[PDB]
Structures are given as C-alpha cells and as structure tokens.
Write a structure and sequence with these properties.
This is part of a larger assembly, with 1 copy of chain A, 2 copies of chain B, 1 copy of chain D, 1 copy of chain E and 2 copies of chain F. By secondary structure, chain A is mainly alpha-helical. Chain A is built from 1 helix and no strands. Chain B is an alpha/beta fold. Chain B folds into 3 domains: 81 residues, Beta Barrel (Thrombin, subunit H), CATH 2.40.10.170; 277 residues, P-loop containing nucleotide triphosphate hydrolases (Rossmann fold, 3-Layer(aba) Sandwich), CATH 3.40.50.300; 120 residues, Bovine Mitochondrial F1-atpase, Atp Synthase Beta Chain, Chain D, domain 3 (Bovine Mitochondrial F1-ATPase, ATP Synthase Beta Chain, Chain D, domain3), CATH 1.10.1140. In chain B, the strands form 4 sheets. Chain B has a 6-stranded antiparallel β-sheet with strand order 3-6-1-2-5-4. A 6-stranded parallel β-sheet of chain B has the order 13-12-14-15-11-16, sandwiched between helices. In chain B, strands 7-8 form a two-stranded antiparallel ribbon. Chain D is an all-alpha fold. Helices cover 93% and strands 0% of the residues of chain D. Classes of the chains: A mainly alpha, B alpha/beta, D mainly alpha, E alpha+beta, F alpha/beta. At the C-F interface, β1, α3, α5, α8 and α12 of C face β4, α7, α8, α11 and α12 of F. The structure holds adenosine-5'-triphosphate (ATP) (2 copies), tentoxin and adenosine-5'-diphosphate. The site of one adenosine-5'-triphosphate has 12 residues of chain F, from α3. Chain B: It is a peripheral membrane protein. Chain B: F-type ATPases have 2 components, CF(1) - the catalytic core - and CF(0) - the membrane proton channel. CF(1) has five subunits: alpha(3), beta(3), gamma(1), delta(1), epsilon(1). CF(0) has four main subunits: a(1), b(1), b'(1) and c(9-12).
Amino acid sequence: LEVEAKLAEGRKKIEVELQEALGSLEQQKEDTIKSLDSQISALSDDIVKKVLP
Amino acid sequence: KKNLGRIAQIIGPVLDVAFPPGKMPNIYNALIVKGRDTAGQPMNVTCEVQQLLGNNRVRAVAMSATDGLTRGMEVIDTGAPLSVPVGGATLGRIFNVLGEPVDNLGPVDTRTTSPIHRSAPAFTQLDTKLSIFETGIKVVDLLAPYRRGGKIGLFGGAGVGKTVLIMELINNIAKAHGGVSVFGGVGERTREGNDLYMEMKESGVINEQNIAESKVALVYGQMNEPPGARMRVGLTALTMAEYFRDVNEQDVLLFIDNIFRFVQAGSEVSALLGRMPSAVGYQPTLSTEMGSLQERITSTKEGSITSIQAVYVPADDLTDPAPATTFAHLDATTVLSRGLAAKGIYPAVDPLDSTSTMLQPRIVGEEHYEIAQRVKETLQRYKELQDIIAILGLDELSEEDRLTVARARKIERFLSQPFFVAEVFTGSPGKYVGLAETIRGFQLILSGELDSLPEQAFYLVGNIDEATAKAMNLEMES
Amino acid sequence: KKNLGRIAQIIGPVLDVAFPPGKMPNIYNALIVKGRDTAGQPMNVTCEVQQLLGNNRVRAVAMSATDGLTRGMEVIDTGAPLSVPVGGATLGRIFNVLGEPVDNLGPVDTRTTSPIHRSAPAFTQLDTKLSIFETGIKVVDLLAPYRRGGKIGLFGGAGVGKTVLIMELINNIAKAHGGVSVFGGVGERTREGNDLYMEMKESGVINEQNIAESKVALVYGQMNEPPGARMRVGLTALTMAEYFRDVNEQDVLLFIDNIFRFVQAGSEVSALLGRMPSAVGYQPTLSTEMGSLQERITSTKEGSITSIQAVYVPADDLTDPAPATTFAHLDATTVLSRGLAAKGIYPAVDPLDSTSTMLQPRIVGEEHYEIAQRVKETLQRYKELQDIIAILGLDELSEEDRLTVARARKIERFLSQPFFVAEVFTGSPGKYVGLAETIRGFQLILSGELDSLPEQAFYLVGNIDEATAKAMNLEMESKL
Amino acid sequence: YKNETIQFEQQKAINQVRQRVFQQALQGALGTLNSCLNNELHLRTINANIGMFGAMNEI
Amino acid sequence: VDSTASRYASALADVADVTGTLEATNSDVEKLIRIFSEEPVYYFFANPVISIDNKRSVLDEIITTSGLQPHTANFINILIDSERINLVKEILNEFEDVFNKITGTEVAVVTSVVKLENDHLAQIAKGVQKITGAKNVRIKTVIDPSLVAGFTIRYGNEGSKLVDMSVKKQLEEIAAQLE
Amino acid sequence: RADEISKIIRERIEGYNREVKVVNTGTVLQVGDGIARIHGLDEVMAGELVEFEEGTIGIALNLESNNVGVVLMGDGLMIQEGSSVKATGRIAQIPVSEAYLGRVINALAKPIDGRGEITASESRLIESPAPGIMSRRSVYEPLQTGLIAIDAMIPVGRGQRELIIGDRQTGKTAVATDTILNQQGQNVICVYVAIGQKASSVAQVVTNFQERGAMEYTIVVAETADSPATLQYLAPYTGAALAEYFMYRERHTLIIYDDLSKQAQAYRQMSLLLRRPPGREAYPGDVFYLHSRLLERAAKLSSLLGEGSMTALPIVETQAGDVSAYIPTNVISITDGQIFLSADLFNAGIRPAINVGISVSRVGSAAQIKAMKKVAGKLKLELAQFAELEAFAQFASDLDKATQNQLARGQRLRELLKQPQSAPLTVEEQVMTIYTGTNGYLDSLELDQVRKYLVELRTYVKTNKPEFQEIISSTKTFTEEAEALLKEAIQEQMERFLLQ
Amino acid sequence: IRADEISKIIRERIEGYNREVKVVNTGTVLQVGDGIARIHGLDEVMAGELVEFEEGTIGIALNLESNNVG
Ligand SMILES: Nc1ncnc2c1ncn2[C@@H]1O[C@H](COP(=O)(O)OP(=O)(O)OP(=O)(O)O)[C@@H](O)[C@H]1O
Ligand SMILES: Nc1ncnc2c1ncn2[C@@H]1O[C@H](COP(=O)(O)OP(=O)(O)OP(=O)(O)O)[C@@H](O)[C@H]1O
Ligand SMILES: CC(C)C[C@@H]1NC(=O)[C@H](C)N(C)C(=O)CNC(=O)/C(=C/c2ccccc2)N(C)C1=O
Ligand SMILES: Nc1ncnc2c1ncn2[C@@H]1O[C@H](COP(=O)(O)OP(=O)(O)O)[C@@H](O)[C@H]1O
C-alpha cells in the first residue's frame, strides 16, 4: 500500500519535473536564438559580398 | 484569374477535364464545374482531381450528380483542396460533403475554413496515456473496456444492432460528456439521420435557440448521395473534429456510421477510374485509403478524439478485406454476431471475439482482469462443448462439464442489458449498470451463489440484485 | 556472338532486347548482357531467350539480379543453350545455375561442357527391370518400397518432414551406394544447403583433402535467386546426372529438392512473358514443363537414374495442379500428413494414401505383399470406425472391433522411427531397421502376441525386440 | 535525455536562422545581379565555361 | 520505341533508306505535318463515318496538287486502308526522329538567357559530337529567361541526358548550407 | 563563433560552385495515386532513385519501351505535369551507423523522434545479396526468449528465421516484444520494424521499451497506415540493412518484422498500380520471391567473417485461423520453422497460446544448451503424444493406472508451460522447472498449486543455493552435481509446501 | 503495339501495294514462342490445314485471325 501511493506520487513528480525542465530548456533556447539573431545580423553583413563568385 | 478548361469525357462520376498546357491543378484540387440544370447555373457541382492523365488533361470525381453535364462545359480550379467551415460557428448544424448547410437555417461564417486533406499528426504529437472509460454496457465495460482518445469498432452484419448500439452509446456518454461530439454519417439511412436530429432537438442538445451552444455538429452524406460524396463525407466530419481538437484543445467524440460505406464508395469510384481491381472487388489503394482516415483521428498532446466507428461486415464474412483491414486499425472491436441476435440475447455482441487492448491488469486492476479472464474461460469451454451437445443434448456430459455448461448459460444471459433506446422493442426500461455492479455480479455468478437459480431470470436485467428480484418474482409465479 | 543487341525493356527479370534485322537468336540461346557493377566495373549477367516476339525483339528472362541494369546496354548471343561443365571435373563441387563454381575453390575444368536443354531418350532406351532396394525405413520398405532405377516422389506441406526424410534417405543409401550421386537443390534455404554441405564434409563422402575422389556433385538453386535460376537449376543437375548415366554408364542417385519450386518460378515469370493465366495461378505451360523435366529424368539401358524428389504441396491440398501433375510421373509416392506430424508420429508417411508400383506379390514376395495389405486394411478399419468411436464411446464396439482398433493404434505408433539425422529433434539416436525385421515385427503385431504391451512402448522404436525391452523398462518404472 | 535533445534542437535552430540569412543573401545577390551588362560579363564567363566543357569532353 | 506510330514511321523511313529518296520524302512528310496540323484536315481524314471511297478521292487530289513521293503517297493510302488514321500526326512526328537516328543527326537543344554567336554554336556542336559519337549534329535555337546566366544543352535519345550551369549551381550551393 | 562556421561554409561554397556531370532528365506524363510515369530517362538504371522538382524521392522500377515507371516515396500532391525529373546516380542507399541505437526512424533512415538527425558515415544498399552457402556456418548458439515453451520445446537459435504466425490479438506482438526486452544483458542488437500499424500502437511499444530500459540497444523502424505504399514496402529492407551492418561487424542481431502481411499488401497495391497482372487473390506472382529475398538475409556467418549473426522473427497474420491462405503458406514455406499462436488456446487460459502440435523448429535441440537438451530432449514428442492420448482417452471410459499417470503428468506439464506477461525465465529457472516437471514430482500436488509451488521452489533455490546458478551458467551442462542439488531442493521445498 | 505490324510487313506493303493480292504461296514467321507461331499471309489456307515451316517443323492452323494465322 505504502509503495503504491508513494510511487504514484513519485511518477507524478517525475513527469511534472520533466515538464518544468522542458519549459526551462525552451526559454533558454529562445534566448539563445535571439542573441544568435543579433550575431546573424552581423552574419548578414559579412556574407553577401563573398556569396558572389 | 483562376485557370479554366473544358470537360472531355463524362462516364458516371468520372469527369475528364482538359486544361490549358500551362496550369494543371494538383491532386485533390476542387474543380468547380459551372454546372447547368433545367434552368439556371448550378455551380454546386464540385470535383476533386484524382489523376493526371497527361496531354494537358486530368481526371476528377464528382461530389454531386453528373446527369446534366454536357461536353464542352467550363471548369474553374480553386487552387486549393476542398475546404469546409469549422469553429464555433459550425457548432449545432447539419452539413454536406461540400460543407454546405442543410439544416434549413442561415449560412456559416467562412472566417476559418479548413481543407479536407490535412496530413496526419507526427510521432511527437501523440499521447500514450492508457485509460479506461465505462459506457454502462455490462459486456463492453467487462470483457473489452473502452479507451480514451482511441478508436472503437462495432463490427457486425446487417440488422444485428450496430445503429441501436451506437445510439445507446450516444445517450449514455454524449449527454454527460464534457466536450463536444461530432456525429458524422457516411451513408446510413436518412431516416436514422432525421430521427437522431429529432432526438437531439427533443432532448435539447442542439438548442433551437442559442445554436452556438450545442456541443454537437452533424455531417450527413446519406445512402443516396453519389459515390463521390460518400467517399469524402467522412473526411469532412473528421476535419471538423480535428479542428476542434487542434485549436480548442478539447475532448471530442466522433461517431462514424459507418466506414464500410466509405470503403465501398472508394471501390465504386476506383472501378470507374479504371484502376485494376484488387481482391474480390475493392480498390488496390484500400489499406492506404483506410489509413488516410484512421490516422488523423488519434489523440494528441493538446486534445483527444475518442471516435466510435461502426463497421459493417459484408455477408457476415469477417474474412473480407475491408473489415480485415479495419481490425488492424481499431483499438477495441465489438463483434456483433447474428446467432446471438437470433436466439434473442441483446445486445448481440460476441463476448469471446470482442477483444480489446485496454484489457490489461496494469490498466484495469487485477480483480477486473481475473473475473474477465474467468468469464472468457467458461464461455470458451461452452463453445467447445457446443458441437457435442448439438447432436446429443446436455444429458451426456460429465459433472464438471454440466456445471460449466449451466454456468455458461447463466453468464451469457446475465451479459444482456435492456437499453434506453430499446424500450420501443422490449418494453422494459433501460438499465445502466457500471463496473462496480458488473464485477461483483459476475463474481457471484462464477462463485456459484446463484447456482440454485433458474436461467430466464437473468434475461434482460441490469443489476445482479435485479436478476435476484426477478428470480424471486418467477418463484412468485408459483 | 558477333550480333549486338540493345536492352529495350526490363520489367524486373523480363528483358525484351532488340537485335539487328537478320541476326536473331534461337529459342533458349543464352545472352550475356554487358552490365555495370555499382563500383563502375562491368557486371556480366546471363539471360536465356524465351520467346521471339517479332520486330527484331526477343524476350529473355534473367538468370541473375537485374537491379543495376539499364536500357540500351550491350548483349551478345552466345548461340548455345546454357553450357554447364560436365564429367568428373564437377565431382565434389558446389555449383549454380550457370555451372559456375561457388564452393570458393579453383575454377571448374572447362574441358567438357554440355548444353542444358536437350531431348529425352527414345522409347527403345527405356530399361525395364522392376526391382526394389532397401532404404532402412520401416514404413517405406513395408508399404511403399522404392524402385531402383526409377523415380520416387515425396509430398507434404511445409514443416512435415520431407527435407529431413531426404536427409535420412541420403544417410542410408548414398555412401553405401558404390555409384555416383548428384544433389539438385531447387529453391532451398541456404541454411539447409550449408548443413548438407558440412554434413557430407564430415561424412567423408566428398573427401576435401583429395578432390575429384568424391561421389557427389552439388547444385544449388537457392531461394534468394530470381526466377531464372530457380527455373534452370533442376535442368542443370539433370544434365550433370545425364552425362553421368550415359557416358559413364554407372547407376546414379538424383536428389531433387524441391520440384515445386520449378513450377513456382515458372508461374512467377509466366504472367509477364505474355501468357494468359491457367487455373489457381499457374502458367499454361505447366504439364509440358513438368513432363519435359520428368521424361528426361529416367533410366535407360546404359545408365540408371534412381531419382528421389520432394514435391512441396501448398496448403496441404493435393488438388493443386503441380502436385496433380507430379503424381502421374512419379513411380512410388509417399505423402506426409500434418496429422501424423502433429501426433508426433515421425516419419509422418500416410500409410493409407501413399502407394507404390513395386508393391506387387510377384515383385516383392508373397508374405511381404500380404503383410503390407493387412497393415493397410487395419489402418483403414481404424480410420473408418474413428468417428463411430468418437461419438459412441469405445465400450460399445465388438470384441473384434476394439481388438483391431488397439492393434491399429499400435501399428500407427510402431510406424514411427528415430532417425539418425532427426536425433537433434527427438533426442534418441537413430535405428536402421531391416526389411525382414519390419515384416516380422508387423506379423507379430497383427497376430497379437504383444497384445497387452503398452502403446507408448511401440513409440520411437526400431525393432520389435527393442519394443519389448522398452515395455519391460516401463513395467519396471510403473511399479517403481 | 531532454538536455541532449534541446542541444540538438538548438543546433537545428542555428541551422534554421542560417538558412534564412542565406536566403536573404541570395535575394540580395539576385538584386545586384539584375545588372544586364554584368550578365554579358557572365556571358564571357560562360564562354570560358564552354571551354571548360570542352575540357570535360576531353576528360 | 515500340509506339505503333514509330513502327510505321520506321518502315517508311527504312524504305526511303533502301531506295535513296531520303531527303525527297523528308521534305514530303515535313509538308504533310503542316497539312494535317490544321484541324479540319485531320478531322475529315480520321472520322470513320466518311466513306473510304471519297476519302481516297480527296487524298488523291491532294497528292496531285501538293506533290508526294510515289512510296509516300503509297504509304498514306496504306494507312487509310489499314485504319491507323487516328495516328497520322503521331506517325508524321516519329518520322522526324527516326530519320534523325538514321542519319545520326542528333538534334540538340541549347538554352541560355540571350543568343550565342554561331562560334559558340559550333563549339557546343563539336562538343556534343565528341560526347555522343554521332555522324552529324544540328543545334536548335532556344532562349530561357528562367536561367540566370548560363547554358544548359540537351542531347541523347530523348532530351534525357542534360548538362547545365545556370540555376543548378544556385540550388546546389543552396543545398550545401541547407544540409 | 556564429560567423566562423559560416566562414568555413563560404570557403566551401567558393570551392563549391558547379561540377559538370551529365544528369539524365526527362518529363512527366502520368501522375496518379503514388505512381508517376516518366517520359525519357533512357539511361536510368533499374531501381535508381530519381528527384522530382518538388523534391520527392522516387524509384524507377518499370523501364518500359516508351515511358519509365517510377513509384513515389511520399505524397503525390505538389508534383506538376511536364516538370523535370532528374536521375540521382544512386541505388536505394541508406546511411547507417551505431548512433541509430535508440531511435524511431522513418523508412528513409530519417528520425521521427525529434532528437535531431543521426550522424552516419557508411551507406548500404536497401536490396543486398545474401551470404552464400560457404559464407555461413550451422546454428549452434541459443537465442534466449524467456518463455518456457519457446525456449524449451521449439528452440530459436542465433541466426534462425522463426515465424511468429497467429490470429489477431493472440499475443504475437507480445511474444516478439518479450523476446526483445529479455535481451538486456545478453549483448544483442534488437531492431523492431512496424509496417502499417497505428501511430499510437507504435508509441505504446516505444514507451514500453523506454520504461523497461530496452531502448538503449534497439532501433524502431516504424511506419504508420498513412505511409505511402513504397515506404510500407521498403521498411523491412531498410531494417534488414541496419541489422546487416552490425551482423557483418561481428555483432549479434535480432530483427522483428511486425507484420509481414501488411508489407505484402503494400507490394500488392503498388504492383496493381503499376498495372502488372495479378495472381491468386490479386497478389503479384512473386510475393514468394519478395519475402524470400528479405528473409534469407538472416544467417549465422562463418568464422572467416567474424561469426556475426542475425535472427529474424517475422510476424504474419492468419485471417480467421486459416494457414492455407496464400501469404501464410508462402511464409511457412520460406522460414525456418514457425510458432503458431491459436486464439482457442488464448481464450482457454493457456498464455502464451503456443499451439505446439503444429509448431516446429528446424534447428532443433542445437539451439539449446547441454542442460536443457539433457532434461528435455524428448519433451515435444512426448507432449504431442500426451495431447493425442488426452484427446483420445475420453472415448474410452475406464483406464489403467499407467495411462492415468501419463495423463496426470501431461496435465502437470501443461500447467508448467503457462507463462505470464513480461515475466522472463532465465536458463537456470528453465532447466530446474523442466526437471521438476518431467521427472514426476509434480503429479502429487494439484493443478491449482502447480504454479505457486513452482514460484516457491525457484525462489527457494535462488535464496539457498547459488551454486546451481553457477553450474548452469559457467559449465552450461546439467551435471549430476547440480541434479543432486536440485533433487535436495525439490524434496525440502515439497515438504515445506505440504506443511504450508 | 499491335500484331501483324512488324515494321517489315509494312515495308513490303509499301513496296508492292498496288491492290490487294493473294499471298497463299508464302508466309513469313512473325512471332514464335512456347509452341505457337503467328504467320502472316496464307490467305487461302483452311482452318486446320497442316502448314510446314522451314526445318521440317510441321504446324496446324487453328486460330486464323485478321491478318495472321495462329
Ligand atoms: N437491446 C435490444 N433489444 C432488442 N432488439 C435490439 C436491441 N438492440 C438492437 N436490436 C435490434 O437491432 C435491429 C436494428 O439494428 P441496427 O439498426 O442497430 O443495426 P444495423 O441494422 O446494422 O444498422 P445499420 O444498418 O444502420 O448499420 C432492430 O430490429 C432491433 O430489434
Ligand atoms: N502470457 C501472457 N499473460 C497475460 N496476458 C497476455 C500474455 N500474452 C499475451 N497477453 C495479452 O494478449 C493481448 C494481445 O497481445 P498482442 O498485443 O500481441 O496482440 P496482437 O496479436 O499483437 O494483436 P495484433 O496482431 O492485432 O496487434 C495483450 O493485451 C496481452 O496483455
Ligand atoms: C437511369 C439513371 C440511372 C440515370 C443515370 N443516373 C445515375 O446513375 C446517377 C444519378 N449518376 C451517378 C449520375 O449522375 C449519372 N451517371 C450515371 O451513373 C448514369 C448511369 C446510367 C447507366 C445506364 C443506364 C442509365 C443510367 N447516367 C447515365 C444517368 O443519367
Ligand atoms: N524423423 C523425425 N522425427 C521427429 N521430427 C522430425 C522428423 N523429421 C522431421 N521432423 C521435424 O520436422 C521439422 C521440419 O521438417 P522438414 O524436413 O523441414 O519438412 P519440410 O521440408 O516439409 O518443412 C523439423 O523441425 C523436425 O523437427
């Protein structure tokens, strides 16, 4: 009985911690893409001149 | 300017459309023929590009009648697949294959349209939450529990009770169901359709005033609509259901009745389109046309579609390719038999053959699992002894054999339930009996407390104590 | 060879190739398509002209995988039906359809060759001696004796034991037979081919250490190969054995397996070549195809081809056309029944369905004929009273009825035998049984001297003395 | 698992924005390339490439 | 190709080959194409309801007026007799490429933004001959503005085999970074 | 850091402008329901991939006289008539590497798990030749499944194609899944191929794998019912390619086609859409060759190839218990013995529902260890004989003590073979169980206490005496020593059971 | 894609078309495989008449068709 209740609770906890970690990785990834958007403005500057052979 | 072309050949629903060299439409682009009738221009004739015949012409099938189209009429191409209105506006209405309202009321707001051919959800957008769901049918809740978000099939012949069974499932579940239902009828009786609409109005589900709050949307391509229509009414109903699921993130019910008419419509279409026939008469793309429907139904992370699809088995032959291909798709199949219906045990589901995937102990509980397996055991033993007892009689069996036979009779009769939509045939009220009564009643039956009881008292009773009371009433009839 | 044709259509293994107007190959003339392997090197694939269809176009099937070929490649008409190395050069060697060596040793001594397609012997050549040889198997040598210098056919569904029974017939007959054997494998699992190869390796019959001392030459038309090889390897092994019988005039053994894979590949290729379908799915050229094979496999005055071949029947049904056409060409037939296979009675030779032409009084001895007749009669009485029993109970039969029922079940048990090669399947070692031993044991069984011994004592037992010993051991185990 | 998954997916997002910026580079390339007189320069370049095609013909 | 049209065209052209009236019937069918190109000519000659008698009559009048080879007028009457007249345009079209495969005249399609000089035409023609192995090459003139700056010349039995550098370079350097 | 990778990219594109190679390219005449004819392409090989302008992979199968028959690997919607199609110069290659372990992938060896693309160096042909006669050796290793019936009576050895045939809902997928997830500590490579199955059913299998831990060493090449016919047809070949890449590199492999009848249906569809003529039941003539070219790439390679191995457990489906059907008879002819799963035995409580009477194993006792061979050589024959006798001993009313004792021991043997779900039995437990049964100890106690006494006996030996485990593992032979230990254990635990 | 149109019979018809004449003296071999043969000409042959090719291989005219003889 004790392991049943506590393990239901434990698997619930594991899945909701999975969802929290997922949200955190999502927000971090989006921030990195925006910083990359600034870096890639610099990239857009330094590409078009060489793209023409 | 939408490109325009001429009609080359008309042979049944096949419409051969010649187009300019430049812009031939893609597959499934709804070709709208201008259309001419007795007087006036019925633009209603809508097709679907199915092939590219080469030499700047294409082949399409007609979602309406073709009698009246003459050679040299023009076509327009809408550049997109045939779209249908969706959303809150479509809640509480009757529709066509063309997304055209039939319910004798105003039009629908075309703000959010959805094409019919939308690719299935990917592998990351599934859900593996195994879950039971009771319906109040003793046998359905016991021997083959139903699943949430997953398909269910009422395999059976004709006249054995698929429509009555699905109507009773409607009245049980949908009335208290916490989301939306989408009843889509792929080629069933227009009388059944009208009567269902009448019940939806009498009970008030589609509120005649305030039609926006109705939680039920109907799509009807009946048994007289052309095979071009009865092959895509299903897809229309499915697009409505999956729009609800994808956007509003709800639990949707989708009652298809019944997909074999869709399969047969496909057969009649392909035979005229000139493909080489596969087994006995079907199209070669049968598994693919089946899956292209069955796979856009599955429950996703945002919403869940628990569709109950009746399936019609031709000539009582489960070996036929259409049921033998739908079995691979459905989760829990309820095989209605004709023998049980003849001997009167209604509903006439076959307790052995009706097999689920959710009937697992780590899903349902070991007590339910044990009692279900024991019922299947005793019924299997009876089915085995049936051949011997046909010739001889119950007189010449052993002691355990006679005990198992008597228990089997009592089981197969206790497995019956009077329905709320069967009161016009039995006269006995409906009897809703959930799993809490079901498991205990069968536990008593396979324990043997009711061994001294007669058999006829379990016939058409909900509760096990209802059967006991009727038994004491049978002994009260001396 | 001079004339150069261009590949025009390839629908899988069907190659329609166009030639210059005047130089058109003959039917069955081999074609060498100049291919190109995926590494850029050429890939020579052989073909065989099946049908001249006009417009300078012939239809040739591919003996090898066509994947990688293209339209417009070169082809060259070698003018001859497929030439296979023949003679003593091929002894102890593993081959393919084209006579190529695939045992991965030195190439074959190309000195002698012979075209695969040829004609049957005339009506004069037919050798007529009706004489049986002993195979060591009880049910075989009692109810369906095999005809030396004849044809023996085995029927059965898949998983019943005809491959293993050919293995058994090999292990008994082949090595002791002073003559030369040839094993033809038509549509055979690579596992079973390799098993045969390594078992004959260990058994010394090939004598690897000194090649060209062997007595067996192996051909292998495997199952992975396209329909051309499965159509031609039976004829290949036949042409080898035919050289052996004619030029070397020594008694040959020809194990063909299967014979139905021949007609399988035939029906596969037929629909594409332009023919209309026959019955259940076979080709129109069925009876003449199997006749062309069988009437070439025969015994003449010079040499005698004793040929065992297994006919795999589909779905256990003997009404299929290819089994139906084999029966008329096979002298002594033995059908395996999935029922006898299920009840563990192995070998599962159906005693009532299987018949032989050798089982005649004058041919095999009066007492042997009569004992065979009594075995058949008793088993038939059992299988007739079967359902009478099954619905009445056993008590309500007469004394004679119950007696013959018990003795028939005892015969049915005794017809089983531990095989040398089936040791892996049973667990007990094999038992070669002599014909006289079989006859005597069945005389005892029908006369009823063992008529209180347990049934399971007659199970997996060679001789009746071994059966009595087993009964005594069980009688000890019972009280102990 | 989610850590390595988001690492892979972030790399794919870098690939995505790379695709988009390189699309912009190609559009600006075509915009500058719309010079018809430079096409004639590209025509003499493609004459040199006809010479190179003769070289490949030799190969 | 086993197209029945190609069968008849091959028969006609091969009769022309074994006689020596090759160009004389080449011009003949070259004009027959433009005869049948106008629709009522083909419709009249093809629809079977019209009597074969007056069909042949009008065909003989056209023979006399426009001028046809003996064997070629014979061949057209052979078609009108054996009822392949639904395939007349197709036969006249397959005659062209069967005669080209007879003379080894590999007709090639070169495609650029603007016209090239006949010096470039001779360059590409000699290149196509040294890759093909033909007896002769006749280059067709085309312009394709969908190309940006380059040439994509076609050869082979059909226009199957192709070499190209205008926008193939664009999409192939697309795919490198879009790996 | 963001720009320097684009720097290497631009030094690439400077050296990457154009390379003049002659590509075969013709036009498109017919496009319908996955099948598209081609005009031209006179130099495209048989089976060579093509590229439609949209970017759709294809395969050219029918090289007809005028046109080319090209099947589509994908949808056929965006393809336009008259557009160009370009030959690729490759033949059905598949990128393969060790990274695939743990990935659910499409038939194009592309991931659908959302874990980003798989890095692969080598590329192997979808259609590949089989190892020759001399390039294999006989089967001698055992492949452990975990079920007592399968691993005792009808053994499956490493490199034996064993067909799991059976009706619907009889436990075929469960048998294959248990065979897979039993392999955690045996160092094999599993490959689960699903052809024409529910996306959700595939997801259930994958989640079960992920929670049981068997995902580390397992690829799941899955296709759903919406997948095009060419993809459903080529799925098992790609799975077999992934398997063969390890099989050659001295690994041990296990692949499960589940199921084959859906692939045969996909090939029937694509052949009937290529307008080829149909044979019996509208199948093309060569579905036999179709299945054989796939299955006969399972083998136990010789010593001069590293003794690699690949065992195929293909699953088929008898519609309505009929083995006489065309595809079932073909596959029971092709494979190396089969395993029949009967719905009647599933109903009547005998799980797994292994109908032994029509089950076979062509490798035989050569796929067991010496211990289980010594304890159960005659087991399948005697169990078949006892099935006969128990079937026959009801016609006769009265019987003697010897027949009744054989009958009772046969029923105890039937109680032995019952095996629950996801409960694997190691070889030690299997040997001791077969011993305790076949000797004749179990006849005294009754059929309801059989299973529980077996559980208690196994727990008792595992607690008390680990030298039985040690013997059966290290020595692999059922020595008189281990037999004496096991008999002591049976006696002691039988007395204790009588007490309890 | 039709029988009797072999691109050589058309050639000889182009050579000698003038009017429709008998051919029963001669007959070419158009298609031959698996024991049959289609023969153009023999316009006066009877149904069942033993026809004889080169090399002495006899035949029988069973299926007389539009322009050929099976
Ligand atoms: N609980 C019940 N009691 C008595 N009769 C029943 C019951 N359920 C179903 N039936 C019988 O079923 C018959 C009609 O079955 P139903 O229309 O539901 O199936 P169907 O004919 O297959 O439907 P469809 O053809 O539209 O799929 C009625 O005649 C009715 O007598
Ligand atoms: N040994 C066992 N003990 C208990 N239950 C079992 C056992 N073996 C199988 N089952 C049950 O049988 C059911 C069906 O198994 P499975 O999923 O293999 O069906 P299936 O044959 O794959 O059906 P389909 O082929 O249509 O997918 C499962 O729900 C499983 O719980
Ligand atoms: C007498 C009825 C059947 C008229 C037909 N109508 C139909 O069958 C239905 C209404 N369909 C599908 C049409 O729109 C017309 N095409 C036909 O199928 C048909 C079918 C048909 C075949 C043979 C005889 C008569 C009709 N049209 C000819 C029709 O107009
Ligand atoms: N004499 C025998 N005793 C016991 N089993 C046998 C015997 N012969 C064959 N078998 C069984 O038959 C199975 C396959 O037989 P096989 O020879 O392959 O028949 P087929 O070739 O028709 O499939 C083997 O696994 C083996 O166990």
